[PDB]
């Protein structure tokens, strides 16, 4: 969860 991407997207 560090940016708009990814699994959990930052913010999730």
Same mark, same amino acid.
């Given at each position: 969860? &560090?940016?708009?991407?990814? +699994? =959990? +997207? &930052?913010? =999730?």
């Amino acid at each position: 969860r &560090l940016v708009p991407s990814g +699994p =959990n +997207p &930052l913010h =999730n």
